[PDB]
Write a protein that binds this ligand. Structure first.
Ligand SMILES: *[C@@H](C)[C@H]1/C(=C/C2=NC(=C\c3[nH]c(C[C@H]4NC(=O)C(C=C)=C4C)c(C)c3CCC(=O)O)/C(CCC(=O)O)=C2C)NC(=O)[C@@H]1C
Ligand SMILES: *[C@@H](C)[C@H]1/C(=C/C2=NC(=C\c3[nH]c(C[C@H]4NC(=O)C(C=C)=C4C)c(C)c3CCC(=O)O)/C(CCC(=O)O)=C2C)NC(=O)[C@@H]1C
Ligand SMILES: *[C@@H](C)[C@H]1/C(=C/C2=NC(=C\c3[nH]c(C[C@H]4NC(=O)C(C=C)=C4C)c(C)c3CCC(=O)O)/C(CCC(=O)O)=C2C)NC(=O)[C@@H]1C
Ligand SMILES: *[C@@H](C)[C@H]1/C(=C/C2=NC(=C\c3[nH]c(C[C@H]4NC(=O)C(C=C)=C4C)c(C)c3CCC(=O)O)/C(CCC(=O)O)=C2C)NC(=O)[C@@H]1C
Ligand SMILES: *[C@H](C)[C@H]1/C(=C/C2=NC(=C\c3[nH]c(C[C@H]4NC(=O)C(C=C)=C4C)c(C)c3CCC(=O)O)/C(CCC(=O)O)=C2C)NC(=O)[C@@H]1C
Ligand SMILES: *[C@H](C)[C@H]1/C(=C/C2=NC(=C\c3[nH]c(C[C@H]4NC(=O)C(C=C)=C4C)c(C)c3CCC(=O)O)/C(CCC(=O)O)=C2C)NC(=O)[C@@H]1C
Ligand SMILES: *[C@H](C)[C@H]1/C(=C/C2=NC(=C\c3[nH]c(C[C@H]4NC(=O)C(C=C)=C4C)c(C)c3CCC(=O)O)/C(CCC(=O)O)=C2C)NC(=O)[C@@H]1C
Ligand SMILES: *[C@H](C)[C@H]1/C(=C/C2=NC(=C\c3[nH]c(C[C@H]4NC(=O)C(C=C)=C4C)c(C)c3CCC(=O)O)/C(CCC(=O)O)=C2C)NC(=O)[C@@H]1C
Ligand SMILES: *[C@H](C)[C@H]1/C(=C/C2=NC(=C\c3[nH]c(C[C@H]4NC(=O)C(C=C)=C4C)c(C)c3CCC(=O)O)/C(CCC(=O)O)=C2C)NC(=O)[C@@H]1C
Ligand SMILES: *[C@H](C)[C@H]1/C(=C/C2=NC(=C\c3[nH]c(C[C@H]4NC(=O)C(C=C)=C4C)c(C)c3CCC(=O)O)/C(CCC(=O)O)=C2C)NC(=O)[C@@H]1C
Ligand SMILES: C=CC1=C(C)[C@@H](Cc2[nH]c(/C=C3N=C(/C=C4\NC(=O)[C@H](C)[C@H]4CC)C(C)=C\3CCC(=O)O)c(CCC(=O)O)c2C)NC1=O
Ligand SMILES: C=CC1=C(C)[C@@H](Cc2[nH]c(/C=C3N=C(/C=C4\NC(=O)[C@H](C)[C@H]4CC)C(C)=C\3CCC(=O)O)c(CCC(=O)O)c2C)NC1=O
Ligand SMILES: C=CC1=C(C)[C@@H](Cc2[nH]c(/C=C3N=C(/C=C4\NC(=O)[C@H](C)[C@H]4CC)C(C)=C\3CCC(=O)O)c(CCC(=O)O)c2C)NC1=O
Ligand SMILES: C=CC1=C(C)[C@@H](Cc2[nH]c(/C=C3N=C(/C=C4\NC(=O)[C@H](C)[C@H]4CC)C(C)=C\3CCC(=O)O)c(CCC(=O)O)c2C)NC1=O
Lengths: 248, 55, 164, 177, 164, 177, 177, 164
């Protein structure tokens, strides 16, 4: 839980001033004002949509979800209103496969990649009982969303250091890319789909493109293979005084 | 072990080898002072133990 | 690397804006206060062996218990690693006076130092006593200029504050 | 990102050396004419709305099959996404002219850009011409040799500043090549 | 509000940091440009009735069709409302010279104005032809000082790029 | 989130006048002592970890029942949270002293702070004291009359800026009452 | 994940067999020596902070280029991340010794670890050396043959637990090689 | 070894003749030149541990990437073999000033070197950067004399041109 990249080599996460404004009885929040407001809305538009580059006649259909956001200052309700939009399903649901839609919900709303096939198949268990709105509100009303983001900050890609699986850090680095990278470049076709269902890992050059500036992006590759052989049984011996002991 | 706190203040003396980041450790690991590379000196292989006795 | 230039365009990129007429004024402050922080930096570069020789034995004149068996400076490799770790710190103080902000300190020297020094039993109060020795060793007309002592003794007690 | 002062620090930390007396006359001579860096970044971003419009409109007049059906700026959603797509190219050059180093241009704009432009069918041979038109227009604003908009500057030269920014447009011009 | 002070205290608050030396260097640039961007701000407060009365009657020199029925200014009542919407911009150009940033321009006179001038059928390209008439009629060496000219012209050119 | 230059214009949009020659002298008496304000705010942030830890431990000394069982600063989890809170109060007052305007403190810190302490049981009679300890310790570090750490300054009058940062500690002690 | 009893029932599920008295005599001795398995894992977690810092600094001792400019344990930023990582490895092999099956070490810790290290630049030959020190530290606490720190056990052999945990430490080297 | 003696003997052995008057005239050149090249070979043989270790970390001061994972300066053994392999090359230059030709450098250092530094993946531009640093470190009146430094540098860039 130290995480040597997070507030060192990246920026600080954006969001509202505090969460004590909800208990204030003459206001609802520290009132930001329309220069301090819309530059936070620029960071929700760059995160729920990727870099989708939404036009002026596509933002006009999102007029109602901002007008509620500048009165009720909850960030989580703004993210929930933008994921049920037409502009979220015409980019990430309409021309994609099912695990491509699921792997972008982990990117846009959690900042991580899915850790399992069992965690991934339970999101298709919620598709059968309520469609795509049952997937979206179960991510938003989860415990993992509450104890990382809450109502206060935008859901950002967080370098944690103490990931519950090491593979979770790998699939986060494939999902986000560089800053000149959107998420329409594949023709559908989930990137993490082979590695979730089989149990293997990712490619080292695709992860090191998305690492920050100043973190040895790519070195360490020996010129032999990049993954491990599960069938190999090596002999690793320890020197004692007399000989060499192969505690296998 | 000597305690070193029971002495008078000013009598425990210490002195570093060089007050430099680049002589104590270079960019390579060939350090004369830090780590396991202190045995890699061109002298200090033999010694003077013909000083004492044949004991 | 928090500086004056690498914060006004890390906010110009967070809103998707051009270099504003606000941010062309903040680099006009880099023109004014450079000549007190460059002349405080160049004084440290030609005097570095002298100032870290005196800062290092201020730890060991104060704390004679460090040569006990199991303590921090218990052999000559550890004494040499003590004078290295105060040679590194005032090199970063020399770096912050060139960049102009507190960038090179808190991403090369301070980040991790709570977690590194606790695990290896290196005391924080001996690191502070070396840096706080040379904060009031600075003489205001004799060593450097009047305002050049302000810049040099701003990053020093930044490091005394962030360690303590 | 690193600016022009933090580049000198990360070169000397590789040597573990103090920033001495020899590198500081490359940094006292940065801030000596350092008014002119502010006095010429203002010459680009004052005209930066007209500069991206004349860039891609001259991209049409030398490759007129872009607006044919099949071309990548055929329809009206695609033409709006390349006026704006060259706004971002013009924005991260003007950061790097303010910083003195191309670190914020290469990490935040040039990483993976050609990697996506073959994935979207953007013809990269005609986007190089989109960059190099506004490369020529920016270096005559700094030189103050334009026909219209004679912005009143102070007398001297910005010949080195005109060629530092021409190196920045050649970095994006070689990344997607 | 966008100023040169509110950038460095919101960038310090977002990381949870005390105001360090790079922040205080950026306030020092606000003291340098204050001798030019305030003298141009006070020049606009008394010369406005000869320069907002120069612009709009030369706005209609290029744009002659706006006095025709069916267009915007077909009667005398709306030209008197046309001189209200250019006295509302020179009173906001005067505010941003006082506060340094682009705060009173972008969050009062710019935000929302793409949608009012779309729906109410007002041409934006006569505002661009009228704000730029105050640019080229402005000369330096009689009217104001040297650096008071280049701060005023850089703030007339900000909302030209925002309206276009 | 305003500063002192952005207070005179939000008093003048209500009249919708140009800010003319009469009220511009109040901001020319801001940049006269601008280096005096910069020299004053540097002295707080250089002593800030000692200003908090002397304040919170003196609250234990003046009120020894706080570390009894059932007390508010009893255990190590609670004692770290009060030291965390006094760091944020001294940080937000120092934001207000640099801007010269209390609208960084009253919005980002003082909204809902009265209702949060009564929801958590945090007693305000000790936090009015521990704010007022570092109120009196801040005017020592500005007017150079502290017992230890005589910092190096320039010879003049700073007793207006010491009283102005006393008023920001009056805005804290009014709101948490 | 699985443990030593769940590993047997997934072997019998490939044959659709019943876990009968032929297969149960391995599991009847896992519970018979089950006191010694618990007696061995608090011999490791009672000494785990000393074990990590000796193994990481003992790797610096045999390789001093890890702490020079350009080593990947250079600053405080990189050295605390190396100390965190060796505590994670020692945590997952204490889960695997407790279960009696190396499933949870192999899918959560070791799966995908080789690709993190060749993207972040971590040297894997010296990282194997820090794991191979704390393998030798772990077999000396279990058999009670450490030079300091004699713990109080009961008498007998724990020689099959010391080589079971030595095979769990050997899987870490086989997965990052 | 390729020398002055072994060249003129092999040339008069392939022709099948006795040592001529021109074969004795070449060994007289070995006499008048031996004063300079034995001064360089004695200056090097006394101070070789300080010349090798000064050039061994001039490799890693130019190429800090060699401590990355998988590279050639990862661990303690690989830098022990690196400082050895530089000390091997400086011993062979000491052998070439004694013999008088490029004999020991050819047979023992250069032949077969391209196939070993490629199979084991040792970057041959870093077995050069240590040799090129020593050639420019030499002060021509300070360490040796004028003609002793001509001979010392001419065997130093024979090795550079043989690795390049
Ligand atoms: C940081 C350590 C500074 C520093 C600041 C100063 N604090 C000053 C006075 C003061 N201290 C306390 C708490 C103290 N009194 C106690 O009775 C106990 C224990 C129970 C403690 C820890 C109080 C209550 C006061 C007086 C506040 C007041 O009544 O006005 C002080 C002297 C007065 C002043 O100049 O501000 C300073 C300078 N002290 C230091 O030496 C370093 C630099
Ligand atoms: C913390 C001090 C524990 C403790 C741990 C043990 N360490 C054991 C062996 C060991 N330690 C090192 C590193 C040490 N040697 C060095 O050369 C350097 C510096 C460069 C250091 C820090 C090594 C190399 C080894 C041996 C591993 C091997 O043979 O490959 C150890 C083994 C038992 C023994 O030493 O006989 C233990 C238990 N020892 C303690 O008692 C406290 C609790
Ligand atoms: C090998 C690692 C040791 C050694 C081990 C033996 N321990 C034996 C028995 C034993 N250990 C414990 C404590 C353990 N059981 C628990 O339930 C818990 C925590 C909840 C712990 C830490 C107990 C209770 C016992 C049983 C005897 C008793 O009740 O006093 C043991 C006896 C064999 C057996 O009964 O399994 C051995 C050989 N003794 C050694 O000499 C090496 C160093
Ligand atoms: C430091 C300048 C380098 C670096 C060098 C390494 N060189 C390595 C091995 C090596 N060197 C030679 C040539 C050397 N041996 C000789 O007998 C003579 C002449 C008498 C010479 C010049 C050989 C034949 C070898 C391979 C045999 C061996 O292991 O010694 C070497 C070891 C390679 C390895 O460990 O696999 C290194 C690391 N390393 C660096 O980082 C820069 C490039
Ligand atoms: C124009 C006819 C009115 C007027 C309008 C304003 N409304 C403002 C904010 C606002 N309006 C609504 C209602 C509408 N928006 C929705 O999203 C929905 C339901 C889907 C409805 C019915 C809401 C909820 C809000 C608050 C959200 C926000 O903060 O924008 C408004 C802004 C006030 C301000 O600047 O704070 C204006 C000016 N006001 C008028 O004076 C005329 C008569
Ligand atoms: C002297 C004032 C101290 C003391 C210090 C010791 N420090 C030891 C190691 C050490 N120091 C640092 C920080 C340093 N390394 C850097 O790269 C930079 C910035 C570029 C800095 C400031 C680190 C990370 C380490 C640990 C790794 C290493 O060995 O280099 C040290 C050895 C640790 C040990 O005993 O195992 C000592 C003894 N000793 C003293 O007595 C006072 C407190
Ligand atoms: C310290 C001098 C006080 C005191 C403080 C305690 N505060 C506790 C919790 C707490 N405090 C705050 C307010 C703080 N957070 C902010 O973001 C800001 C300003 C923007 C401030 C001032 C919050 C929101 C919380 C709740 C979060 C949390 O509990 O960590 C607290 C612990 C209460 C508990 O453990 O339940 C203490 C002890 N108590 C004192 O006695 C003095 C007067
Ligand atoms: C009141 C707190 C003091 C006192 C203050 C005065 N300070 C004066 C001048 C001054 N301070 C600085 C450094 C300041 N400016 C910066 O740009 C930065 C950091 C980026 C800092 C910390 C400067 C540069 C100056 C100007 C003088 C010079 O250039 O040498 C001052 C003179 C008037 C003024 O310019 O403000 C006064 C009176 N002196 C006192 O009597 C009390 C104790
Ligand atoms: C120390 C023995 C090594 C070494 C370690 C470094 N690791 C660095 C980052 C890092 N390590 C891991 C793997 C770890 N985290 C986990 O969650 C799990 C499994 C549950 C494991 C094994 C991750 C995922 C990361 C990146 C995440 C992050 O830190 O934010 C690291 C930092 C590199 C840098 O600063 O660029 C170092 C230095 N390096 C060494 O040289 C020794 C051999
Ligand atoms: C001539 C260019 C300069 C000059 C340069 C300095 N050299 C310094 C030290 C030094 N130089 C060498 C290389 C040289 N000495 C040898 O014995 C051999 C080969 C056998 C060579 C090529 C070495 C090994 C050293 C370190 C030992 C020493 O002399 O102290 C030097 C001192 C600073 C430094 O440590 O580099 C300087 C200034 N000296 C001059 O006077 C003219 C102007
Ligand atoms: C096919 C159709 C077609 C066009 C749309 C134009 C587009 C166009 N304009 C310019 C050329 C230019 N563009 C500008 C920029 C500007 N000029 C101004 O008066 C404004 C202040 C500012 C924004 C409009 C300038 C100043 C030049 C002249 C060259 C220069 O001085 O840099 C160039 C030359 C660039 C080059 O040589 O690579 C081209 C192709 N030309 C065409 O053939
Ligand atoms: C930080 C840097 C940065 C960038 C440069 C852009 C890069 C970029 N451009 C486009 C997207 C595009 N880019 C172009 C550009 C062009 N096509 C042409 O014919 C011309 C040669 C050229 C200039 C007009 C077009 C037309 C599209 C739209 C393609 C589409 O709609 O699918 C997309 C896909 C976005 C999406 O729709 O999801 C991305 C990531 N984004 C960034 O974040
Ligand atoms: C906040 C915003 C901000 C700015 C816009 C600039 C404004 C600015 N430019 C210059 C000053 C100058 N500007 C120029 C530049 C030029 N003269 C020419 O004939 C060339 C066409 C052009 C090259 C690009 C020169 C040559 C000087 C004077 C020399 C110098 O000090 O650099 C000066 C110094 C005053 C003077 O020297 O007269 C100032 C304040 N500085 C700022 O702080
Ligand atoms: C604060 C905003 C502000 C401006 C934009 C200018 C604009 C301006 N110009 C003139 C009026 C004038 N201005 C000039 C000046 C010049 N004519 C030229 O062609 C030369 C380039 C230039 C010399 C510097 C002249 C000669 C007149 C009188 C003729 C006229 O009506 O333009 C007037 C009438 C009152 C006056 O003379 O000041 C105004 C308001 N003045 C301002 O106060």
């Amino acid at each position: 839980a130290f995480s040597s990249i997070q507030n060192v080599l990246t920026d600080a996460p954006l969001g509202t001033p505090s969460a004590m404004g909800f208990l204030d009885e003459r206001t609802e929040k520290p009132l930001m004002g329309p220069s301090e407001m819309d530059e936070l809305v620029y960071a929700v538009y760059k995160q729920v949509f990727g870099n989708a580059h939404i036009m002026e006649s596509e933002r006009a259909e999102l007029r109602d979800a901002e007008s509620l956001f500048r009165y009720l200052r909850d960030v989580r309700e703004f993210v929930r209103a933008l994921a049920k939009s037409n502009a979220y399903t015409s980019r990430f649901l309409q021309g994609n496969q099912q695990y491509r839609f699921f792997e972008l919900n982990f990117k846009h709303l959690l900042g991580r990649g899915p850790r399992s096939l069992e965690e991934m198949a339970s999101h298709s268990a919620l598709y059968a009982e309520g469609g795509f709105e049952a997937v979206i509100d179960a991510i938003l009303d989860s415990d993992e969303y509450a104890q990382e983001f809450g109502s206060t900050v935008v859901p950002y890609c967080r370098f944690k250091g103490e990931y519950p699986t090491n593979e979770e850090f790998n699939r986060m680095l494939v999902l986000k890319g560089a800053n000149s990278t959107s998420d329409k470049a594949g023709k559908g076709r989930s990137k993490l789909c082979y590695s979730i269902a089989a149990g293997c890992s990712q490619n080292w050059l695709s992860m090191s493109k998305a690492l920050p500036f100043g973190t040895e992006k790519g070195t360490g590759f020996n010129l032999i293979s990049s993954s491990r052989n599960p069938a190999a049984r090596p002999r690793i011996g320890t020197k004692i005084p007399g000989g060499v002991v192969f505690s296998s | 072990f000597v305690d070193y706190q029971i002495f008078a203040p000013g009598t425990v003396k210490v002195s570093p080898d060089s007050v430099n980041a680049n002589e104590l450790n270079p960019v390579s690991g060939m350090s004369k002072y830090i780590g396991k590379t202190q045995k890699l000196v061109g002298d200090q292989g033999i010694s003077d133990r013909s000083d004492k006795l044949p004991m | 690397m928090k500086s004056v230039i690498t914060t006004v365009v890390s906010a110009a990129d967070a809103a998707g804006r051009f270099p504003s007429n606000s941010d062309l004024e903040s680099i006009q402050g880099n023109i004014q206060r450079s000549a007190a922080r460059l002349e405080a930096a160049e004084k440290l570069a030609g005097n570095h062996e002298a100032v870290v020789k005196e800062a290092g034995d201020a730890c060991f004149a104060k704390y004679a218990y460090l040569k006990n068996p199991g303590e921090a400076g218990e052999n000559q490799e550890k004494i040499n690693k003590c004078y290295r770790d105060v040679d590194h710190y005032m090199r970063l103080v020399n770096y912050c006076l060139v960049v102009g902000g507190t960038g090179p300190l808190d991403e090369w020297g301070i980040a991790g130092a709570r977690e590194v020094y606790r695990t290896l039993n290196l005391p924080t109060s001996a690191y502070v006593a070396s840096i706080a020795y040379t904060r009031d060793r600075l003489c205001v007309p004799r060593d450097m200029s009047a305002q050049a002592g302000v810049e040099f003794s701003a990053y020093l007690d930044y490091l005394i504050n962030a360690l303590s | 990102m690193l600016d022009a002062f933090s580049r000198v620090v990360v070169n000397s930390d590789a040597k573990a050396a103090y920033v001495g007396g020899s590198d500081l006359q490359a940094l006292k001579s940065f801030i000596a004419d350092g008014n002119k860096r502010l006095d010429a970044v203002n010459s680009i971003v004052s005209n930066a709305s007209c500069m991206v419009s004349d860039a891609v409109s001259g991209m049409i007049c030398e490759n007129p099959g872009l607006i044919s059906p099949g071309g990548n700026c055929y329809t009206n959603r695609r033409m709006a996404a390349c006026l704006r797509d060259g706004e971002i190219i013009l924005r991260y050059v003007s950061y790097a002219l303010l910083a003195g180093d191309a670190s914020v241009l290469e990490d935040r704009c040039l990483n993976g850009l050609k990697e996506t432009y073959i994935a979207l069918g953007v013809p990269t041979n005609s986007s190089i011409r989109a960059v190099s038109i506004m490369k020529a227009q920016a270096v005559a604003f700094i030189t103050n040799t334009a026909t219209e908009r004679k912005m009143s500057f102070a007398a001297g030269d910005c010949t080195s500043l005109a060629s530092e920014v021409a190196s920045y447009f050649d970095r994006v011009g070689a990344a997607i090549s």
